């Protein structure tokens, strides 16, 4: 019954996309944008860059290839992707005990009909319980979580000093500290986007296109209009 | 019965809009306002800018298009949007167990009437229990939460130094620290608005207009009169 | 019975108004006051400014329109407003289970009178239980909470330096820090007022006038006499 | 029975007045005092100033009207006032369940006398239970809490530098910091007084005079003799 | 029975007086003492100054009236006074349930004697239970707590700089900081005395003289001999 | 039954690969890459370097052997590898008690058939219980966790100062602190990759190729295109 | 049965070797290595040095005897070794109660066969219970944990200053702080290796060779190739 | 039975010796060692110095008597020694209740044989229970814990400054701080060794020789070879 | 039975002596020692000084009387002594309830023998229960804890500056801070020794000699040989 409740409840693909914080951009008349999209997750999003480009072009911006002559940069990295079962949150009643119980109780459906108390009743009841447990275990409330990192670069007129500071860990004992200083006319801001795709027995190939659509729309809407 | 209680209780769309903190503006005789509204959430709020403009014009302010000649700026970003089920807070009695129980108990309504103990009683009881569980599971106490970031800019006479400081994270190890300094005659303040729309089996298309109305009224009332 | 207890207990509108901290003003012979009242909440408090003006005039102070020639400023912002059900604090026994139980037990009132055990007894009992649950669910112990921010300005003779410091958050990564310095002959102090209006099935239109009265009286009494 | 216990226990008005900390004043031969009493609470304490003046005059001090020629200042503000029910601390056994139970058990008083098991017994028992629940709910153990802030000013011969420092919060983001410096021959000290008035079904009009008496006596006794 | 146990246990007035910390005074041949006793509590301790003077004179010290020519100062302030019921610590078994139970069980004393099962037995039992509950509720284990602040001043030969520092809170936002510096030949030390008076149904008029005696003896014994 | 549920649920090899944080690389026209892969874990991943080289070459980059003339460095170390049983999370119902119980209950399958209550029934039941416990204990839900450290070096034009700081612990008492400074034109960033391979009775030889494939794809995708 | 489950589960020697953190070594053409292996644990690991030397030679490195002419140093210390019983984690069901229970229940195997209720049944049952408890207690799930400290030294060209700082504790009261400074051309890094050997009734002589093999392979693989 | 389980489990002397941290010594050609072993514990370890000397000589080092001409110093102090009962960890079932229960149940062994229900059965049962409780209480799972502090001194060429800092506590109030500075050519490092000897009814005289052997071997192995 | 278990378990005097931390003394050829032993505890340890002197003389050291010509100082203070009952750790089953229960159950020993059910059986049972409770209460598992502070002074050649710093508390308010500086050629170190003497119904006069022996041996062994 729990599997039936899960199947009835989350019978439709539900997709959520949430930005972490807001990046404020001053109004400007420049239109050039340069995109750089990477994917270091096990899942596949090959069309994300194209969808981002289409959404950006829909706002009047012009997408260029050489980063030198672009006023805006959209750097995105699909960093992490995980798949989990929400039914596992309860721990119990998920392995298949309830389905097994229902299947076993189904044996009363054979004690009251046709041959009964003939030994075959126990076998039929055991088979029904096993089938019920298998069916209950094969129903999964799958949720895909995806973490994307976005870095927006905006060209300015004030000199910007970038101070690279890295502390490369070195075997418990210590670390190597690297520091450097550069000067350039470009501001960079970061943000994080979290995506969720929930369904019953969901396969990522079905959730991929709408996930890409929502992520591209959000990242493009960072730019505004 | 729990589903019936939820349906009776939250039978009307309830909308709440709460501002985080107060932004104090000194009295002034200037009227020009420039609006910039963005939406990086999965939900659609397309009429928010128009409603904000109408509410601002209702207060005697004049909305202009070029930010250079505007005394006030209203920068808003509909940052986040989430949908949740309040019935999930209890965890149990929400999957549909209670409705299933009521449906099963309905079988006594067929044991006392017409044919009984004929085997068909068990089938009718099981069907009624399944239908009751399905009906109980299909009743949702949905709540939509919306997070909006507002940034108000007011022109002043004192020189304002903006110190851009960003710490762009770089792979566990370190970060790139960007710093810059600009000078301009403009103060900027921030605030956050949280909106909630609650109803039973609510669809966001119904809650959208009143949500926009309340959000626009609050953001415009920041300006006063 | 719980709904009956709630209805009996909070049968009268109860309104509480509490200031957070005390603002100490030195004795002075000046009388001019300038009011500025804003409302960024979903609730409507339109008469608050007029009531504040009347209460201030009742103390001998004179209300002026131009802030330049006013010795005192009363800046108020009705910031937040929320509505909650106190019965929800128990969680259970609030959905309507107790009323349903009473309604079901009412079926014994039909088993002992007129026709009984005729099948219609179960139907009448179920209808009575449903009606009891509906009646229990429709009784709400509503409490409206209002948060108001007050800022009192008093003109002095010592030069006051205002150091505007703002840290506008910028996308997880960083922030823009704005700093400015002004000099003027005016001190400003803040405070917070919390208002509560409690009743059974209360509508805010009934609680609005007394809420405004108490809030205006408190804010005016800040000035003393 | 619980309501009866509460009524028997707290049948008399109990008033407590507790000062927070001690303000030490050096012995002096000066007698002039200037009073300034304000009330920013919803409760009415109009006679507090007169009672303070009478208590101060009873100690040999002389009350003056112009603060310039007063050696001592007594600045008081009745800041907060709240009303609560102590029976609510238990949560349960307070709504009226126990009174309802007693009223229902009273039905045995009609089963053993006159007509019985006639249907009217159930109605009489239900009416008695309802009346008992209403009576139990209508008994309240009310406690009024009052918070008063006292500021005593004493004239000295050493130059006292007052450094006004205020951090006016500005919309989550930041704050405006106001600083100023003045020089004068006056020390100021603060303290807090907490008053409690407890009774059953107490109305504040009855507890007002003794509350004022105790508060005035404490504030005057700060001065000593 | 619990009330009987409390009455038997704390049948005698028990008074405890505890000093917080020790004030060390160097041996000296000076005898002059100046007393200054104040009372800012709701309780009345009028004879405390006289008892302190008597105890000090019993040690060979001489009490003077003008503070200028006194080597020692004894400044005392009876700051706080509270009254509580120790039986309330258990919460339950204190309202009167146990006495009510005993009174109800007393009805068996009328079922076995004279007329019985005549209806009057229930009435007599109910009256006995009510009387028992009333008697149990009217027995109170009262404890009076008194907090006194003591400040001892001793004249010395080294110059003592007193730095008055006060932070007068100003409405959530900020504070006014007052600082001053004086020079004088006098050291001052503080301490706290806590007094407790415990009895059953105790009235403060009975506990006042012994409380004053113990407090005066302790404060005088600070001086030694 | 629990073992059957585990076998049905995790019947397919599930491999997850998650990067810790994002390493941002500026766009560049350089293609040369130098690989250095080490493995300090007990598991064997010998083909990881070849797969990384193939994936990098698929992106248009050119792999060189001498690190001096390489623009990019990919340094990877398969640091840790652990194997655990997820069924051990429950602690109980995993040792084999449930399988033993089922096997023992199987004895009723021999009491109802053929010879019964002949002593041999107990022996057959005990053997069946032992076999069931053994079968339940031999089903393992194995999960392999692999921790890999990645260090990417990118050649730049700004001088980079590396400050080696190490605190070699010396016997509880103290430490030897080594510090040195070098200058070079190369930035280095770190990151961590976590891999999981889950199955029932999984042998690492089966999970090795897919684990290597996913890890190589992620590390190569760090470079982008 | 628990002992049987443990024996079935961990019937094979399971050995795990995990490095704590990664030591990064720059690519170099030098091959000379100097080994120094010590063992301050109670267990015997005598072949570890030879296995490390063989593994290092298998990578093309050349092992030398004089540390002066060695480019690399491999300093290792087998610091700690502990042996524990995993069955002790449950605390109960481990002493032998379950085996005793099974042995006692075996007495029913003698009540149903041959002589019974003859007194000898109790003796046989007691002997069987004692033997079962002894057998259950004699089955141990032994786990050997080994902690090894590794220190790798690499010759460089930059001057390295070693600051020896030691705080030798001196009897609760204090410490003796020793500080010294040396200069040399050698970097040193540390790391920790944790080894586990798990089996039923395992003797360390069986787990020693594979433990040495894995530890040597890991330490050598630090060097790479 | 619990005593029997303990006796069966820990029937053999188990000795563990664990060093806290590793002391790293640079390779050197010097051989001279000077030993200084002290024992401030209640237990007797007289042969520890001789065993340390033998183990050191077995490594090729030469033991000298005058510390002036020794390159290495081995300073050891057997600081603490404690004896505990592991069975006390359970608290209950250790005093002897279980043995008493078994002894009492043994009375059924006399009710079924020879004379019975003759009064002597109760006496025999009581005596058996007392004997069983005594036997259960006399079985102890004893564990001896020893804490040893080791201080190794190594002669160097760099000047080492020792800063003696001690804070001798002085009666709650304060402390006497002693500081001094010396210069010498010697480094000193510390470490701690923890030894455990576990057995049933173990006497320290049996565990002493192997404890000394393991401790000496570990301390000598600090030096290496 | 619990008292019997305690008496059987701790039937022999068990004495433990544990030093807190190690005091390291450099090797030296000086022999002179000066002892100073004080006892500020309620217990009597009069022979401790003599035993310390004997133990020190047994090591070849020479004890002198004038501290000026002594190379070593042994300053010891037997600071604290406490006596506790370990049986009180359980709280319950210690007052004597179990012994009372056994004594009461002994009444069955008189119901089955001689006269019975004659009223005298109850009296004999009550007397036996009272005697059993008294006997159980009179068995105490006494543990004496002794805390000793040791201060060892060693003469050196480096100048040692002692900075006396004391913060004498002055009545809650403040403190008097005393500071002084002296110079001398002597180092001082501290340590703490904890002694425990455990037995059933132990009297300190029996545990005194062995306590002194162990404490003296430990303090003397601080010096070594």
Numbering used by the authors:
A (entry chain J), B (entry chain A), C (entry chain B), D (entry chain C), E (entry chain D), F (entry chain I), ...: 1 to 225
What did the paper state?
Following transfer of IncF-like plasmids, recipients become refractory to a second wave of conjugation with the same plasmid via entry (TraS) and surface (TraT) exclusion mechanisms. SFX, which is mediated by the OMP TraT, is specific for Gram-negative bacteria. TraT is a highly expressed ~24 kDa lipoprotein with a copy number of approximately 29,000–84,000 copies/cell. In this work, we determined the cryo-EM structure of TraT encoded by pKpQIL (TraTpKpQIL) and the F (TraTF) plasmid derivative, pOX38, at 2.47 Å and 2.66 Å resolution respectively. This revealed that lipidated TraT oligomerises into a decameric champagne cork-like structure, composing of a transmembrane α-helical barrel domain and an extracellular ring domain.
To study the structural basis of SFX specificity, the structure of TraTF was also determined. The cryo-EM structure has an overall resolution of 2.66 Å (Fourier shell correlation (FSC) = 0.143 criterion; Fig. 5a, Supplementary Fig. 4 and Supplementary Table 1). Like TraTpKpQIL, TraTF consists of ten identical protomers that form a transmembrane α-helical barrel domain and an extracellular ring-like domain. The TraTF monomer comprises the same secondary structure elements as shown for TraTpKpQIL and exhibits a similar conformation. TraTpKpQIL and TraTF can be superimposed with an rmsd of 0.523 Å over 225 Cα atoms. While TraTpKpQIL and TraTF (85% amino acid identity) exhibit SFX plasmid specificity, their structures are highly conserved. Interestingly, most of the amino acid differences in the TraTF are predominantly smaller side chains such as alanine or glycine residues without changing the charge profile of the β-sandwich domain; no changes are found inside the TraT cavity, suggesting that the β-sandwich domain is likely the site of possible interaction with partner proteins from the donor. The conjugation frequency of pKpQIL into ICC8001-pBAD-traTF and ICC8001-pBAD-empty recipients did not display significant differences, suggesting that TraTF cannot exclude pKpQIL. Although our data together with previous work indicate that MPS and the pilus are not part of the SFX process, the subtle amino acid differences between the TraT sequences provide the high degree of specificity. It is likely that specificity is driven by either the α2 or/and β-hairpin motif as the amino acids display low conservation.
